[PDB]
Write an enzyme that holds these catalytic residues in place. Sequence first.
Site, PDB file in Angstrom:
ATOM      1  N   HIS A 182      -2.101  -3.951  -8.314  1.00  0.00           N
ATOM      2  CA  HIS A 182      -1.618  -5.064  -9.119  1.00  0.00           C
ATOM      3  C   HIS A 182      -1.662  -4.779 -10.619  1.00  0.00           C
ATOM      4  CE1 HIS A 182      -1.687  -9.380 -10.526  1.00  0.00           C
ATOM      5  NE2 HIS A 182      -0.784  -9.466  -9.567  1.00  0.00           N
ATOM      6  N   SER A 202       4.512  -1.687  -8.325  1.00  0.00           N
ATOM      7  CA  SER A 202       4.929  -0.668  -7.374  1.00  0.00           C
ATOM      8  C   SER A 202       5.759   0.434  -8.023  1.00  0.00           C
ATOM      9  CB  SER A 202       5.735  -1.302  -6.238  1.00  0.00           C
ATOM     10  OG  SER A 202       4.943  -2.184  -5.475  1.00  0.00           O
ATOM     11  N   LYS A 209      12.273 -10.038   3.754  1.00  0.00           N
ATOM     12  CA  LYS A 209      12.478  -8.678   4.223  1.00  0.00           C
ATOM     13  C   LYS A 209      11.253  -8.141   4.949  1.00  0.00           C
ATOM     14  CE  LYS A 209      14.290  -4.280   2.692  1.00  0.00           C
ATOM     15  NZ  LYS A 209      14.274  -3.287   1.591  1.00  0.00           N
ATOM     16  N   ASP A 210      10.061  -8.629   4.600  1.00  0.00           N
ATOM     17  CA  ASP A 210       8.849  -8.245   5.312  1.00  0.00           C
ATOM     18  C   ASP A 210       8.686  -9.013   6.616  1.00  0.00           C
ATOM     19  OD1 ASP A 210       8.315  -6.495   3.251  1.00  0.00           O
ATOM     20  OD2 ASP A 210       6.498  -7.482   2.564  1.00  0.00           O
ATOM     21  N   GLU A 243      -6.310  11.233  22.640  1.00  0.00           N
ATOM     22  CA  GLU A 243      -5.068  10.521  22.368  1.00  0.00           C
ATOM     23  C   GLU A 243      -4.178  11.311  21.402  1.00  0.00           C
ATOM     24  OE1 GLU A 243      -4.773   6.609  23.186  1.00  0.00           O
ATOM     25  OE2 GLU A 243      -5.774   7.582  24.869  1.00  0.00           O
TER      26      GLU A 243
HETATM   27  C1  HEM Z   1      -5.769  -0.143   6.468  1.00  0.00           C
HETATM   28  C2  HEM Z   1      -5.003   0.653   5.716  1.00  0.00           C
HETATM   29  C3  HEM Z   1      -3.993   0.240   4.604  1.00  0.00           C
HETATM   30  C4  HEM Z   1      -3.469  -0.956   4.245  1.00  0.00           C
HETATM   31  C5  HEM Z   1      -3.670  -2.367   4.846  1.00  0.00           C
HETATM   32  C6  HEM Z   1      -2.585  -0.738   3.127  1.00  0.00           C
HETATM   33  C7  HEM Z   1      -1.853  -1.706   2.468  1.00  0.00           C
HETATM   34  C8  HEM Z   1      -0.956  -1.484   1.444  1.00  0.00           C
HETATM   35  C9  HEM Z   1      -0.004  -2.425   0.907  1.00  0.00           C
HETATM   36  C10 HEM Z   1       0.184  -3.878   1.392  1.00  0.00           C
HETATM   37  C11 HEM Z   1       0.683  -1.814  -0.065  1.00  0.00           C
HETATM   38  C12 HEM Z   1       1.814  -2.424  -0.932  1.00  0.00           C
HETATM   39  C13 HEM Z   1       3.160  -2.424  -0.207  1.00  0.00           C
HETATM   40  C14 HEM Z   1       3.674  -1.042   0.089  1.00  0.00           C
HETATM   41  O1  HEM Z   1       4.019  -0.303  -0.858  1.00  0.00           O
HETATM   42  O2  HEM Z   1       3.766  -0.670   1.276  1.00  0.00           O
HETATM   43  C15 HEM Z   1       0.180  -0.468  -0.190  1.00  0.00           C
HETATM   44  C16 HEM Z   1       0.614   0.483  -1.085  1.00  0.00           C
HETATM   45  C17 HEM Z   1       0.068   1.730  -1.269  1.00  0.00           C
HETATM   46  N1  HEM Z   1      -0.843   2.338  -0.434  1.00  0.00           N
HETATM   47 FE1  HEM Z   1      -1.767   1.458   1.220  1.00  0.00          FE
HETATM   48  N2  HEM Z   1      -2.606   0.603   2.824  1.00  0.00           N
HETATM   49  C18 HEM Z   1      -3.456   1.234   3.702  1.00  0.00           C
HETATM   50  C19 HEM Z   1      -3.740   2.582   3.719  1.00  0.00           C
HETATM   51  C20 HEM Z   1      -3.401   3.499   2.751  1.00  0.00           C
HETATM   52  C21 HEM Z   1      -3.614   4.928   2.794  1.00  0.00           C
HETATM   53  C22 HEM Z   1      -4.274   5.614   4.009  1.00  0.00           C
HETATM   54  C23 HEM Z   1      -3.122   5.464   1.660  1.00  0.00           C
HETATM   55  C24 HEM Z   1      -3.079   6.918   1.120  1.00  0.00           C
HETATM   56  C25 HEM Z   1      -3.860   7.948   1.459  1.00  0.00           C
HETATM   57  C26 HEM Z   1      -2.600   4.377   0.865  1.00  0.00           C
HETATM   58  C27 HEM Z   1      -2.017   4.485  -0.382  1.00  0.00           C
HETATM   59  C28 HEM Z   1      -1.139   3.580  -0.944  1.00  0.00           C
HETATM   60  C29 HEM Z   1      -0.372   3.748  -2.157  1.00  0.00           C
HETATM   61  C30 HEM Z   1      -0.412   5.003  -3.055  1.00  0.00           C
HETATM   62  C31 HEM Z   1       0.352   2.636  -2.354  1.00  0.00           C
HETATM   63  C32 HEM Z   1       1.344   2.343  -3.510  1.00  0.00           C
HETATM   64  C33 HEM Z   1       2.676   2.993  -3.152  1.00  0.00           C
HETATM   65  C34 HEM Z   1       3.832   2.680  -4.060  1.00  0.00           C
HETATM   66  O3  HEM Z   1       3.894   1.582  -4.657  1.00  0.00           O
HETATM   67  O4  HEM Z   1       4.722   3.548  -4.163  1.00  0.00           O
HETATM   68  N3  HEM Z   1      -2.782   3.202   1.562  1.00  0.00           N
HETATM   69  N4  HEM Z   1      -0.814  -0.301   0.751  1.00  0.00           N
HETATM   70  C1  LIG Z   2      -9.431   8.284  20.980  1.00  0.00           C
HETATM   71  O1  LIG Z   2     -10.592   9.134  21.025  1.00  0.00           O
HETATM   72  C2  LIG Z   2     -10.345  10.430  21.210  1.00  0.00           C
HETATM   73  O2  LIG Z   2      -9.249  10.935  21.144  1.00  0.00           O
HETATM   74  N1  LIG Z   2     -11.506  11.147  21.515  1.00  0.00           N
HETATM   75  O3  LIG Z   2     -12.800  10.690  21.223  1.00  0.00           O
HETATM   76  C3  LIG Z   2     -13.428   9.901  22.250  1.00  0.00           C
HETATM   77  C4  LIG Z   2     -11.486  12.428  22.122  1.00  0.00           C
HETATM   78  C5  LIG Z   2     -11.354  12.559  23.497  1.00  0.00           C
HETATM   79  C6  LIG Z   2     -11.300  13.817  24.061  1.00  0.00           C
HETATM   80  C7  LIG Z   2     -11.369  14.939  23.270  1.00  0.00           C
HETATM   81  C8  LIG Z   2     -11.490  14.807  21.904  1.00  0.00           C
HETATM   82  C9  LIG Z   2     -11.544  13.551  21.311  1.00  0.00           C
HETATM   83  C10 LIG Z   2     -11.665  13.399  19.822  1.00  0.00           C
HETATM   84  O4  LIG Z   2     -10.970  14.500  19.193  1.00  0.00           O
HETATM   85  C11 LIG Z   2     -11.021  14.489  17.843  1.00  0.00           C
HETATM   86  C12 LIG Z   2     -10.503  15.457  17.043  1.00  0.00           C
HETATM   87  C13 LIG Z   2     -10.755  15.051  15.771  1.00  0.00           C
HETATM   88  N2  LIG Z   2     -11.416  13.881  15.856  1.00  0.00           N
HETATM   89  C14 LIG Z   2     -11.893  13.090  14.781  1.00  0.00           C
HETATM   90  C15 LIG Z   2     -12.646  11.957  15.032  1.00  0.00           C
HETATM   91  C16 LIG Z   2     -13.107  11.202  13.973  1.00  0.00           C
HETATM   92  C17 LIG Z   2     -12.801  11.583  12.687  1.00  0.00           C
HETATM   93 CL1  LIG Z   2     -13.386  10.631  11.348  1.00  0.00          CL
HETATM   94  C18 LIG Z   2     -12.050  12.703  12.429  1.00  0.00           C
HETATM   95  C19 LIG Z   2     -11.594  13.468  13.483  1.00  0.00           C
HETATM   96  N3  LIG Z   2     -11.582  13.514  17.153  1.00  0.00           N
END
Ligand code: HEM
Ligand SMILES: COC(=O)N(OC)c1ccccc1COc1ccn(-c2ccc(Cl)cc2)n1
Lengths: 64, 241, 48, 71, 51, 106, 378
Positions: free
Chosen positions: G200, G204, G226-227, G270
């Site tokens: 914020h 964006s 749109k969302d 998985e």
């Molecule tokens: C539970 C996980 C997450 C939630 C609920 C979440 C939620 C959101 C929301 C609502 C936005 C604003 C709308 C959008 O641009 O899509 C956003 C933007 C963003 N998120 Fe996430 N996010 C999550 C995970 C992550 C992860 C894993 C990353 C990166 C490693 C990340 C990085 C970013 C960035 C950089 C933006 C801004 C992007 C832009 O405006 O171009 N977020 N997130």
């Molecule tokens: C849905 O669960 C599975 O797929 N699990 O675990 C019961 C499973 C089942 C059979 C064999 C292997 C796994 C797990 O294999 C892996 C490989 C990498 N991660 C891992 C887990 C946590 C974090 Cl932080 C980072 C990496 N786990």
Amino acid sequence: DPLTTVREQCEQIEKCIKARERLELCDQRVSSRSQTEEDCTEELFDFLHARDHCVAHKLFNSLK
Amino acid sequence: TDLELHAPSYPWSHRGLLSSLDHTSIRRGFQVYKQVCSSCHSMDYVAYRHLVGVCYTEEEAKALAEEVEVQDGPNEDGEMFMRPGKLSDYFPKPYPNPEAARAANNGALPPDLSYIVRARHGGEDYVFSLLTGYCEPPTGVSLREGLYFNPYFPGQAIAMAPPIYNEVLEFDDGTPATMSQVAKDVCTFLRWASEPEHDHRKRMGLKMLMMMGLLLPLVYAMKRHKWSVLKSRKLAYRPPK
Amino acid sequence: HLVGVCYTEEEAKALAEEVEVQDGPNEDGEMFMRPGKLSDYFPKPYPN
Amino acid sequence: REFGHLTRMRHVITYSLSPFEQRAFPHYFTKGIPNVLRRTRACILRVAPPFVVFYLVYTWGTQEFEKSKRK
Amino acid sequence: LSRFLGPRYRELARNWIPTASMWGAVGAVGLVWATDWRLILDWVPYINGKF
Amino acid sequence: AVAASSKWLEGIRKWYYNAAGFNKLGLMRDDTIYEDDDVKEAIRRLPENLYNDRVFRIKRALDLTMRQQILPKEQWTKYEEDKFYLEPYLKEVIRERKEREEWAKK
Amino acid sequence: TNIRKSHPLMKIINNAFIDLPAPSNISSWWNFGSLLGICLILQILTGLFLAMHYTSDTTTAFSSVTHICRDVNYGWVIRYLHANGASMFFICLFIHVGRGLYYGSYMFLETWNIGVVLLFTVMATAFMGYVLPWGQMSFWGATVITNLLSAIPYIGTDLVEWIWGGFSVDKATLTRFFAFHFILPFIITALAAVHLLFLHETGSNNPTGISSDMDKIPFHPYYTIKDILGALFMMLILLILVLFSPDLLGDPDNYTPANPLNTPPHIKPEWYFLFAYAILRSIPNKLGGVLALVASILILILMPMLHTSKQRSMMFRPLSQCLFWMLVADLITLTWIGGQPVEHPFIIIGQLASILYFLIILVLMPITSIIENNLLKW
Ligand code: HEM
Ligand SMILES: COC(=O)N(OC)c1ccccc1COc1ccn(-c2ccc(Cl)cc2)n1
Ligand code: HEC
Ligand code: HEM
């Protein structure tokens, strides 16, 4: 009773006869000498895989 | 070293996306479990209250569990007072010495069947293709005494002796009891047992697809109406010269 | 739970290897008897 | 960051139409079909050649797995 | 790179490396009772800390 | 700085200018720069006629991308007509930052 | 006197969702942030049901889950909503990270770093939910983590014994895995409010990589409608996988119960962990394999430091677009290799693809941006 007659015409397919004939060409190869463990599970897998494909296409009409 | 054989695809009558189960072939298939086996296999998750409505009405289910006699609980001055089964039962179990009853089967215990088509990489196409696919052991394959050569088995030598010949059974309506009418009905059984929600999730999937065919083109019309202001706008740049 | 409060652990098992209560079953047999296995509640008198 | 405090702009005119005065669906297959073909052509040489090399490695990897268990 | 280059950058880092064992050894004493590190409680004969 | 590849390496520069497509949106090269702190000081130092030209060219390109459209090919920005209007102002802002940094360590 | 600009609670909602300035050329790739917020709420109102009827012990875990699909009313629909709803969360997370990598959104430094924390927390949560049903894949997948977790040279042998309930496979193992799985989804909900508060401050990014302060529109009604449309299309795909093929994403061998009875025909997790299992399996050392597992996710934090281009996004960078899709095709290879047995062609392939994943991010991407800088005469 319908399986044992559906399986009969599925063997005269040309894809199933040349999977059958060199299964029996390797029969006189195992009981010939003593220095072998050349089994015949590879030669019989290609027979059953070529055969049971066409059985599944036709068996369920003659049932139920 | 050796390869493995995978089951082919059989055109089941429930294989389609909106296809129901045949409610006569589960009625005939319970009795291929009831009186050809249960001498080796339990199904520890199904009861006779689960059979009413699917294939019986409750009276034919009440008449069974009186072909079996299991050990009920205690009383005062009697110890293990028993009875024939109620319909809320896992009806008998097979063999005692649990998990070591393999002495009756030469070192290989047969498993439970109430989830066996969900637990295999063939579904109910694997159970059919192994139950009707015994062969004679080929050349060079030496067998431990108690092994029977089944090519649809991973170890290639299951301790299973074949359980069905032709007419080990005769049905209630009058149906030929050949080896393929057998094992088609018990493989329409053992799949309803694994998935008793089969016909309910396909009828609910039809009502979902008809509501999303109404709700989606109308929300897309509301989006298209608001965004037409920006889509039709024009820009001009008039700097002082 | 009697060990360390009013008995040491021998002088304690011998009071459990004095009553005879019914254990579970075993194959090539049925409900057998095996007395105090060091972790056993105190025996009730009435079956119901 | 509120709307009247964002940036400085001079000498720009915009014209707009009401949503109830226009069609929600203008030219759809007249303009839209040759537009999505220009966008497909402009990005096909960047995205697609990595996924072709995954396909050739996948076919060589499953075929040389079965020509090891055979004899 | 001349990103963080200079004789100033390691001059304030010259007088802080005496109190930068407040960075590493404080983490080493910050995991004595938060963790129950078993074989380095006999670092001293003094901690018979659990019965 | 090779005299034998004087025309050949200008062919790769002209090819890369067309493979990148900011000229299809009617943009100049200095319109597309990432605005860090040195770039934001150079924008503040621009004369008023070059600032207003840049603001309109960016707004027209954002409006085209919203519609997923480009300009007619006779309105694309030519390669030998692209004016690097921001580069003299940015080289002076960076030289002033590097002067304040040699002073802080000497 | 406008009540939505002066009420203390209503003016927080108005600045966040209604009157928020937003770029006008935002694409459908910006839809997946609110989709992640729908998938997280759905996994909370469905994990309510499962933990109600649950018992977690070595003797009854495999049967406590089979009780719900047959006996517990509306339990087959809610169980497979939960198992496929977690596959939906992971596909909406990989699209989301790849968006911000492509368009240079990592330059929002504080928002990007809280995101990397969010990627670790949902990955560790879902690992401690697949161990709960106690089948063959639950056992042999958990017991390859602790081989690399006891490889920690000092504290590791008392670390695994403290989380296994006390000894090994026993009753209380699934009282610390289940505790670390009920409470971790709520740290994610608090880390998501902080994640949006940092966004914020700037607003964006947009697909061109150029600041858009001259062309903002309000968030309502343009991106609220749109969302909502994009969320309706997500519920259609999720209910199709639940009502027409609820076992498509899964393994049949996890219906075979857990016991040290016999070695399974294979070991595989998985689909959303198959890229990570393929990397550690191609390292013949249980310390080098646990370091490259953590180095495959925490490498995202170096993305602000490795940036050498004068432009922000990849829209005008054709040589960098080729390298981005080589990285996506490299993660498809690792997902396939991680479900294959450890044999001759799948060790030389699975260990060269583990090398190329690190070579693209660290070496090939910073050099190629410098080459493109020289070609544009800066
Ligand atoms: C539970 C996980 C997450 C939630 C609920 C979440 C939620 C959101 C929301 C609502 C936005 C604003 C709308 C959008 O641009 O899509 C956003 C933007 C963003 N998120 Fe996430 N996010 C999550 C995970 C992550 C992860 C894993 C990353 C990166 C490693 C990340 C990085 C970013 C960035 C950089 C933006 C801004 C992007 C832009 O405006 O171009 N977020 N997130
Ligand atoms: C849905 O669960 C599975 O797929 N699990 O675990 C019961 C499973 C089942 C059979 C064999 C292997 C796994 C797990 O294999 C892996 C490989 C990498 N991660 C891992 C887990 C946590 C974090 Cl932080 C980072 C990496 N786990
Ligand atoms: C002759 C005794 C016997 C009969 C009767 C019997 N089976 Fe079995 N079955 C076995 C044995 C022994 C095993 C254990 C397999 C092993 O470990 O080698 C087994 C195991 C199985 C398996 C598992 C095989 C695998 O690949 O995992 C299936 C499926 C099966 N039985 C189905 C059936 C069905 C259906 C019937 C009723 C038509 C039946 N069996 C009747 C002997 C029998
Ligand atoms: C980020 C949110 C969540 C994710 C990614 C997630 C993931 C999972 C996974 C992978 C399973 C295994 C299902 C199976 O293998 O059949 C599962 C089930 C389970 N989850 Fe969650 N879950 C989440 C939220 C929750 C919540 C909020 C709770 C508790 C209130 C919870 C508790 C449980 C329990 C007890 C099971 C039991 C096994 C079963 O019923 O299948 N989870 N979840």
